Amino acid sequence: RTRSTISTPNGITWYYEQEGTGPDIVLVPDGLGECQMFDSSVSQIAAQGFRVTTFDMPGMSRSAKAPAETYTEVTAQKLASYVISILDALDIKHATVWGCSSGASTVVALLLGYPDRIRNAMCHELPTKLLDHLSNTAVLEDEEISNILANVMLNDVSGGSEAWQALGVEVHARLHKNYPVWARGYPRTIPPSAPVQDVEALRGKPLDWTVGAATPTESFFDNIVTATKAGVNIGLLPGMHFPYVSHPDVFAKYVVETTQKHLWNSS
Amino acid sequence: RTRSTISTPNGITWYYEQEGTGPDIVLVPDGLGECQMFDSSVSQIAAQGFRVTTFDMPGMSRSAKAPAETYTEVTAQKLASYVISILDALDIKHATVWGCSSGASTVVALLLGYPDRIRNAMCHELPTKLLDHLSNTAVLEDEEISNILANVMLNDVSGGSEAWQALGVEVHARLHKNYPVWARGYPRTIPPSAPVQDVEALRGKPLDWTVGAATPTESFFDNIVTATKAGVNIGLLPGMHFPYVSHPDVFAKYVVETTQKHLWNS
Numbered sequence: 001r002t003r004s005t006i007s008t009p010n011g012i013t014w015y016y017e018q019e020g021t022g023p024d025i026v027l028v029p030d031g032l033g034e035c036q037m038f039d040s041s042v043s044q045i046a047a048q049g050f051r052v053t054t055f056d057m058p059g060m061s062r063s064a065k066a067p068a069e070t071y072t073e074v075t076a077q078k079l080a081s082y083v084i085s086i087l088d089a090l091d092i093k094h095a096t097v098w099g100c101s102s103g104a105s106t107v108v109a110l111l112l113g114y115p116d117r118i119r120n121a122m123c124h125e126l127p128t129k130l131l132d133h134l135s136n137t138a139v140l141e142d143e144e145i146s147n148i149l150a151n152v153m154l155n156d157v158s159g160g161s162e163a164w165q166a167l168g169v170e171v172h173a174r175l176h177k178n179y180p181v182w183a184r185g186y187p188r189t190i191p192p193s194a195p196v197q198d199v200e201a202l203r204g205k206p207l208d209w210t211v212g213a214a215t216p217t218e219s220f221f222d223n224i225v226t227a228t229k230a231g232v233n234i235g236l237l238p239g240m241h242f243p244y245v246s247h248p249d250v251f252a253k254y255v256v257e258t259t260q261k262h263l264w265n266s267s
Numbered sequence: 268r269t270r271s272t273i274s275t276p277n278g279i280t281w282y283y284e285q286e287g288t289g290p291d292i293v294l295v296p297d298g299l300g301e302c303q304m305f306d307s308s309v310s311q312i313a314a315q316g317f318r319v320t321t322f323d324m325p326g327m328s329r330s331a332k333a334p335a336e337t338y339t340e341v342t343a344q345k346l347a348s349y350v351i352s353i354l355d356a357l358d359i360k361h362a363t364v365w366g367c368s369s370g371a372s373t374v375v376a377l378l379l380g381y382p383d384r385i386r387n388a389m390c391h392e393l394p395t396k397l398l399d400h401l402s403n404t405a406v407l408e409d410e411e412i413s414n415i416l417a418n419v420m421l422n423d424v425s426g427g428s429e430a431w432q433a434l435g436v437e438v439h440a441r442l443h444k445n446y447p448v449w450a451r452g453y454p455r456t457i458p459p460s461a462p463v464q465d466v467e468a469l470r471g472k473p474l475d476w477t478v479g480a481a482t483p484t485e486s487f488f489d490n491i492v493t494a495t496k497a498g499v500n501i502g503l504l505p506g507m508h509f510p511y512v513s514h515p516d517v518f519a520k521y522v523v524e525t526t527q528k529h530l531w532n533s
């Protein structure tokens with residue numbers, strides 16, 4: 001596996017990883033922007049004959065050398081433009097993309113905005129509603145935010161506490177630093193940017209949508225309704241918000257099978 | 268509150284309760300068939316100007332005087348025929364109906380099969396898939412079934428353990444006896460009988476569908492997809508499988524507001 005950095009003309013110095021040869025599959029992180037969450041799955045996916053690329057998101061973890069605009073007032077459309085910039089830098093012309101949460105918003109924006117570049121998109125648990133309890137963390141002190149959100153991740157949405165904790169001290173130290181960046185930059189502006197207001201724009205698109213099997217029905221109820229209205233494939237993965245952490249083998253199998261489905265349909 | 272019995276010519280002697288005067292609202296129990304789960308909500312709903320009727324289901328609790336065919340190999344269509352029989356016996360000509368679980372299958376079967384009798388139906392968490400872990404309890408001894416399912420209700424699907432416990436010792440003593448009846452008669456036959464084969468049959472019907480907000484997404488994921496395909500109103504109630512137990516006030520408000528919406532549309 002390649003582990004390196006690359007700078008794009010928008011001022012972001014990205015940390016990225018890449019493994020394998022074959023059609024491109026790109027794994028976009030969730031809002032916490034931490035790509036070591038994909039470590040196990042990257043190898044499993046690449047071994048099936050794909051070139052797999054992932055990266056820390058701007059302002060987060062090892063991609064923290066970035067202009068303030070890239071991690072404040074963040075929207076799906078901003079993130080999509082940034083992901084296109086690193087795909088350009090890495091000479092990735094066509095890609096299958098995965099994303100969860102703000103990453104889900106991002107990959108739908110990618111598919112809609114850059115259809116020539118995106119083979120197909122997998123979106124998971126895409127936030128479309130403002131949640132005051134999350135937005136309100138943005139005015140707390142840094143260490144208060146990190147303590148609160150570390151707790152929320154572990155206890156409310158990890159979908160697997162043992163796997164979450166087993167990410168280990170190095171990863172959780174980076175996440176600890178990311179929580180205030182995410183809190184101040186994402187929850188107030190990501191949900192209104194959700195690229196799902198136009199159901200007819202989604203119809204017929206190479207989009208596969210998932211929600212966590214154990215996720216409380218209310219959390220992404222709206223995803224299931226919207227996908228069904230648009231005739232978009234909608235299904236479940238085990239766990240909750242982080243299937244690539246809680247169930248990396250099942251996650252990898254899903255990404256591989258879904259990419260293979262669209263490679264067939266393309267031909 | 269009227270608490271009484273009535274015998275229908277299919278051999279069932281029903282225990283039923285009624286309160287209030289006005290348009291009829293009928294509360295069909297879940298598979299456990301125990302109508303004291305509606306106690307709080309019956310009074311709240313009736314107070315808003317409705318005649319509310321509920322009953323224990325055949326073979327369950329105080330409606331246990333019933334032929335074996337009414338609580339074995341149970342289907343939505345059988346249950347709907349039984350509910351129509353007690354509505355006939357109580358001279359309830361037009362009704363709003365609520366049902367959860369097998370009760371949900373029942374009220375959708377009622378709406379489709381007896382459109383002239385049903386003003387509107389509210390269905391909650393309608394089972395459409397066989398679950399082997401539930402079906403398999405049918406072959407266990409009575410006491411093991413009761414122990415297993417009492418635990419499942421309390422800890423997994425009540426949506427509110429304190430409220431579940433607060434049903435009280437007499438209710439849980441009745442449920443204790445119902446669990447093996449439900450296990451042997453329901454899980455292997457209720458899901459395949461789900462009246463949701465034909466989405467076009469549901470389109471335009473006065474149906475309001477809910478799932479519990481805290482219910483794991485996978486449990487009734489299919490409900491949300493089917494309702495949306497059919498253009499049916501689909502939404503959430505607080506809690507999980509027993510909103511009338513866990514959140515009786517919110518439940519009653521929902522039943523009242525939904526009935527009022529359809530009385531206006533009428």
Ligand SMILES: C[C@H](O)CCCC(=O)CCC/C=C/c1cc(O)cc(O)c1
Nearest residue numbers: 030031032101102127131134186187190
């Ligand atoms: C991993 C995730 O991308 C960031 C941590 C927050 C979290 O997991 C809560 C559950 C999912 C919510 C996402 C969400 C919810 C909002 O209201 C606004 C927003 O920008 C994102």
Ligand SMILES: C[C@H](O)CCCC(=O)CCC/C=C/c1cc(O)cc(O)c1
Nearest residue numbers: 297298299368369394397398453454457
């Ligand atoms: C209260 C409920 O009506 C009877 C107790 C079982 C339970 O609550 C488990 C969760 C909901 C499942 C209902 C269900 C599931 C099946 O596979 C088959 C079936 O006939 C009913």
Ligand SMILES: [K+]
Nearest residue numbers: 247248249250
């Ligand atoms: K796994």
Ligand SMILES: [K+]
Nearest residue numbers: 514515516517
């Ligand atoms: K309540």
